[PDB]
From a paper:
Here, we identify a protein (CcpS) that is phosphorylated by Stk1 and modulates the activity of phosphatase CpsB in Streptococcus suis, thus linking Stk1 to CPS synthesis. Thus, CcpS modulates the activity of phosphatase CpsB thereby altering CpsD phosphorylation, which in turn modulates the expression of the Wzx-Wzy pathway and thus CPS production.
To gain more insights into the phosphorylation events of CcpS, we further analyzed the X-ray crystal structure of CcpS-T4ET7E, which mimics the CcpS-P. Although we obtained a high-resolution X-ray crystal structure of CcpS-T4ET7E, we still could not resolve the N-terminal flexible region structure. These results indicated that the highly flexible N-terminal disorder region of CcpS may be not have contributed to intrinsic stability, but was closely related to its binding partners and their functions. Although the electron density map of the N-terminus was not clear, the partially folded structure of the N-terminus between CcpS and CcpS-T4ET7E chain A crystal structure was obviously different (chain A, N-ter). Notably, the ligand CcpS-T4ET7EN has a lower affinity to CpsB than ligand CcpSN. As expected, rCcpS-T4VT7V has a higher affinity to rCpsB and much more than rCcpS-T4ET7E at least tenfold. However, rCcpS-P or phospho-mimetic rCcpS-T4ET7E has no significant effect on the process of de-phosphorylation of rCpsD-P catalyzed by rCpsB. The most likely reason for this is that the glutamic acid substitution can not fully mimicked phosphorylation at Thr4 and Thr7 in vivo.
Author numbering:
A (entry chain A): 8 to 88
B (entry chain B): 6 to 88
The structure:
């Protein structure tokens, strides 16, 4: 199963952040605080290695995550994007 | 169905009003609105926002980390990740 990952297209940001949030909770962290820390810093060290959470965040770029956060916020607050 | 109210200036500036107003001002003046907002969010520099239509004045009512905190909290709540 070493050669299984035959689709390296990025998955949905919502799927990544769901798994990262759950892993943060299991390890006893405040998940919202650690996710804010990653977005402020761009540093994956804010995310634990448990259950591949840090490797999952590394599949994305921070500026890509910020763009989705901004688009989601504006749409939910009344902007027709 | 929710109406936005124009409050007094002594009321705290709400981030939802700032960011939507900044977007509409950037768009009306011909900038790329998402791109300039990302520039602000990455840098903390109000100069990515034009002074036009009080856009820069509104972004200066907040700190970069306050805007990022609200963006994250709004996303996690809206997508059902936090509850």
């Amino acid at each position: 199963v070493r050669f299984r990952l035959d689709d390296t297209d990025k998955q949905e940001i919502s799927k990544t952040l769901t798994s990262v949030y759950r892993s943060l909770e299991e390890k006893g962290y405040n998940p919202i605080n650690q996710i804010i820390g990653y977005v402020l810093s761009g540093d994956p060290a804010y995310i634990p290695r448990y259950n591949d959470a840090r490797n999952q965040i590394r599949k994305h770029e921070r500026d890509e995550i910020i763009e989705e956060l901004v688009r989601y916020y504006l749409k939910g607050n009344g902007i027709d994007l």
